[PDB]
């Protein structure tokens, strides 16, 4: 039995005393509240909150039976007897405690019909209601089509009632989403912080904006993160690494970054981890190697791990420095990993952080451009291991998160004018604020492994991680390449956040090591990825601004149709492309559940209209099915080998016209690709395009804002291609100057305006300078 006794307001926070102790409620924004039970006791701080100390001004009202604590949009309604808190946005009940706070236990009611996304990486179905699973980051080597527990869990859910609930607790725990008791959501942990955070929104985009406002917004990654990565487990030598960079050049595939797995520090998988320094028998001139790659516009990224083995060169030093987690006796804790006997660097301590950070600094001075942190679950984490702030089981799910923070802060301190690249397997809610770019681990080389990636990506995207991606082509096991699967995976790759084929090196992961047919298929697609950089980089910009994920679920298309939540087969890549990956062999056609409206075949320009019924498209080996939304502006630049050469002096923009879309907007975000302060300081060039489409006219208004940046082109040569253009436009005005529209020979003359009757495309070619430009087509 729990009941209200009294309350106090203190520095904008409500402190309630029950018969069981104190509860502290603080609004972290108008739409988000932190609820801390056992508020009187000492416990671990928040990990989920970007500004854990903030408490914005709320209003408090009291009645006989209730308190009401209310920000702008979110209200907490506190029933006195029995004690229970429930949460309202407007007057809509979002979530109600059942027995609430009970070794740490939170129980809430679930509503009938309520669908619950969440839990981070699981392969269970998009709606996790009916499931129970651990909150314990753990490897799932070789997974395919099912997992209740893998590398990067999140103690958070997103409901069809448009709230996000975070269990702000780092410890070994569990989530029971109406499994044991059909109407009960239960959150449990062995130890750690007894708090939860509730965030509300009026739409899924606004909920996500509100969530990232309080948990952290991802800083814009360097533009090179959107390029082509060469990766395998693993390049065995400098000569092999150099030969791979060379193979990209001689096979004419784009390449931005090469990634070195654990052989850079020793010739065997076992026994060297912790060396954190070059194996000179196999990498004899690594500074020359990295400099030579930089001359070709290619970055070098190295793997690191949490573990220092007793057989490694840095064991004695790590012990001397007190850098490793300890046992209860105060000795360094050593335990038997696959790699040999070793300890774990205590990133929660001053000593471990300073020691590890010094190593990163040194290697980064040598030329390393970015960092890969593998095994941060931590993959092995014995229970008696003691960290500076608590035991292994208490801190487990925040280890990777703190490791990202340490490395992020380090990289900002060393290179304040560059954007850190930090790729890691395990984190916590909020890790995106340290730039964490996660991948879905050691996926099997099976169609099932591919078929799960959209579900995983959407689940992580929705709760903060825009750059979630997979090892393209698959990672684990296999004896010979499954060519069709590989092709499908690298096709899908183009339309998901990071283009990083990677796998165990008994089968080649890089597209340049494939047969002639595979390359003929993939080469134009990897170039397409580069041609599309203005589209992808603009979605990245919007992710930094608002948390809007790059991949969006089909359910965003109609928020009143909760049945769409189950879809894990078609997704939006940015605003305009509906993508349906092919995830089994031999598929001859697909049924695409396109939202009602007008849609075009990206590859063939075919126009489809639908009032609700799915569209059936045939498949081919060369592409995967992609539809463009009517009203899309699709921006392209010419293909480059590396983003170091990126220019937008030449722009090509495809507008998909249909009378059903009388107003359309597009934007292109351009900056120097590298300045971490470009957004904050307005050192960018934001191009805007507006189309107004009426019965007799099609009008485009073009403009630029921002203060620009060094090297920004003043005038861009622009080709605007209008798809599904009326054959009845007779003239064009460009800023009031009338230009005749040619009706022949458009591909074969330097025409300023020409209509291609066979393709229904109207091409305009002009100069887009700094002043506003209006293009008016008239019947
Ligand atoms: C971690 C390890 N299992 C591999 C060896 O370092 C990597 O190649 C893999 O991508 C990671 O998940």
Curated annotation (Swiss-Prot):
Gene3D superfamilies, per the entry: Glycosidases, glycosyl hydrolase (family 31), Golgi alpha-mannosidase II
Domain of life, per lineage: Bacteria
Catalyses which reaction(s): Transfers the non-reducing terminal alpha-D-glucose residue from a (1->4)-alpha-D-glucan to the 4-position of a free glucose or of a glucosyl residue at the non-reducing terminus of a (1->4)-alpha-D-glucan, thus bringing about the rearrangement of oligosaccharides
Entry annotated with the keyword Flavoprotein: no
Listed GO biological process terms: carbohydrate metabolic process
Binding annotation for acarbose: 261, 379, 425, 442, 502
EC number(s) given by UniProt: 2.4.1.161
Residues at the catalytic site: 374 (nucleophile), 377, 442 (proton donor)
Keyword Transferase applies: yes
Keywords of the record: Glycosyltransferase, Signal, Transferase
EC main group: transferase
UniProt cross-references to Pfam families, sorted A to Z: DUF5110, Gal_mutarotas_2, Glyco_hydro_31_2nd, Glyco_hydro_31_3rd
SUPFAM superfamilies from the UniProt entry: (Trans)glycosidases, Galactose mutarotase-like, Glycosyl hydrolase domain
InterPro entries for this protein: DUF5110, Gal_mutarotase_sf_dom, Glyco_hydro_31_C, Glyco_hydro_31_N_dom, Glyco_hydro_31_TIM, Glyco_hydro_b, Glycoside_hydrolase_SF
Family: Belongs to the glycosyl hydrolase 31 family.
Function: Alpha-transglucosylase that specifically transfers single glucosyl units from alpha(1->4)-glucans to the non-reducing terminal 4-OH of glucose and alpha(1->4)- and alpha(1->6)-linked glucosyl residues. Acts on amylose, amylopectin, glycogen and maltooligosaccharides, with the highest activity with maltotriose as a donor, and also accepts maltose. Does not act as a hydrolase: weak hydrolysis activity is only observed on the disaccharide maltose.
Protein name: Oligosaccharide 4-alpha-D-glucosyltransferase
Native source species: Cellvibrio japonicus (strain Ueda107) (Pseudomonas fluorescens subsp. cellulosa)
């Amino acid at each position: 039995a729990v009941f209200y006794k009294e309350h106090k307001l203190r520095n904008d926070g409500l402190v309630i005393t029950t018969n069981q102790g104190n509860i502290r409620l603080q609004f972290k924004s108008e739409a988000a509240i932190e609820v801390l039970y056992r508020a009187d006791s000492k416990q671990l701080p928040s990990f989920a909150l970007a500004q854990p100390e903030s408490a914005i001004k709320a209003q408090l009202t009291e009645t006989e039976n209730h308190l009401q604590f209310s920000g702008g949009t979110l209200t907490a309604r506190i029933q006195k007897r029995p004690f229970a808190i429930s949460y309202y946005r407007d007057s809509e009940l979002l979530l109600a405690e059942e027995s609430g706070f009970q070794k740490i236990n939170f129980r809430f009611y679930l509503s009938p019909g309520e669908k619950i996304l969440g839990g981070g990486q699981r392969i269970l179905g998009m709606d996790r209601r009916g499931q129970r699973f651990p909150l314990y980051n753990r490897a799932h080597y070789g997974y395919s089509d099912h997992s209740g527990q893998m590398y990067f869990g999140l103690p958070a859910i997103m409901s069809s009632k448009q709230y996000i609930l975070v269990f702000d607790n780092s410890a070994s725990g569990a989530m029971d989403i109406g499994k044991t008791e059909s109407d009960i959501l239960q959150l449990e942990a062995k130890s750690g912080r007894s708090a939860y955070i509730l965030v509300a929104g009026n739409s899924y985009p606004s909920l996500i904006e509100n969530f990232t406002q309080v948990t952290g917004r991802q800083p814009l990654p360097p533009r090179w993160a959107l390029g082509s990565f060469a990766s395998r487990f693993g390049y065995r030598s400098e000569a092999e690494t150099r030969a791979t960079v060379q193979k990209y050049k001689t096979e004419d595939f784009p390449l931005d970054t090469i990634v070195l797995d654990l052989y850079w520090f020793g010739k065997d998988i076992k026994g060297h981890m912790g060396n954190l320094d070059w194996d000179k028998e196999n990498f004899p001139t690594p500074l020359d190697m990295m400099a030579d790659f930089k001359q070709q516009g290619v970055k070098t990224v190295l793997i690191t791990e949490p573990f220092v083995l007793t057989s490694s060169k840095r064991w004695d030093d790590a012990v001397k420095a007190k850098a490793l987690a300890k046992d209860p006796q105060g000795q360094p804790k050593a335990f038997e990993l696959y790699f040999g006997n070793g300890g774990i660097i205590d990133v929660f301590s001053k000593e471990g952080s300073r020691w590890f950070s010094s190593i990163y600094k040194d290697l980064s001075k040598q030329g390393v451009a970015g960092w890969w942190g593998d095994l941060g679950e931590p993959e092995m984490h014995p229970e008696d291991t003691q960290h500076a702030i608590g035991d292994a089981d208490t801190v487990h799910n925040a280890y990777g998160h703190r490791w990202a923070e340490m490395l992020y802060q380090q990289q900002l301190d060393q290179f304040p004018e560059l954007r850190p690249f930090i790729m890691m397997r395990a984190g916590f809610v909020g890790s995106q604020r340290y730039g964490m770019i996660p991948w879905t681990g050691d996926v099997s080389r099976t169609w099932g492994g591919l078929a799960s990636q959209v579900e995983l990506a959407l689940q992580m995207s929705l709760l903060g991680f825009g750059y979630i991606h997979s090892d393209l082509g698959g990672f684990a096991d296999g004896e010979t390449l499954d060519k069709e699967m590989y092709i499908r995976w690298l096709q899908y790759g183009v339309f998901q956040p990071v283009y990083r084929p990677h796998g165990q090196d008994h089968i080649p992961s890089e597209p340049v090591f494939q047969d002639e047919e595979t390359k003929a298929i993939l080469r134009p697609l990897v170039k397409l990825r580069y041609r599309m950089l203005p589209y992808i980089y603009t979605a990245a910009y919007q992710n930094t601004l608002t948390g809007m994920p790059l991949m969006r679920p089909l359910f965003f298309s109609d928020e009143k149709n909760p049945a769409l939540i189950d879809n894990k087969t078609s997704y939006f890549w940015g605003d305009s492309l509906l993508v349906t990956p092919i995830t089994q062999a031999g598929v001859e056609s697909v049924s695409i559940p396109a939202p009602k409206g007008v849609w075009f075949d990206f590859w063939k320009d075919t126009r489809y209209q639908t009032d609700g019924a799915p569209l059936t498209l045939p498949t081919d080996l060369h592409t995967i099915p992609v539809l463009v939304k009517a009203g899309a502006f699709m921006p392209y630049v010419p293909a480059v080998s590396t983003t170091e050469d990126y220019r937008s002096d030449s722009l090509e923009i495809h507008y998909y016209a249909d009378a059903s879309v009388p107003l359309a907007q597009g934007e292109i975000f351009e900056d120097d690709g590298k300045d971490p302060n470009s957004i904050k300081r307005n050192q960018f060039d934001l191009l805007t395009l507006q189309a107004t489409h009426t019965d007799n006219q099609l009008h485009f208004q073009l403009a630029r804002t921002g203060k620009g940046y060094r090297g920004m082109p003043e005038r861009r040569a622009t080709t605007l291609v209008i798809h599904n253009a009326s054959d009845q436009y007779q003239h064009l005005d460009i800023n009031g100057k009338t230009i005749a529209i040619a009706q022949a020979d458009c591909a074969s003359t330097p025409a300023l305006a020409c209509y291609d009757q066979e393709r229904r495309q109207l091409q305009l070619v002009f100069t887009w300078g700094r002043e506003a430009l209006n293009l008016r087509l008239h019947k």
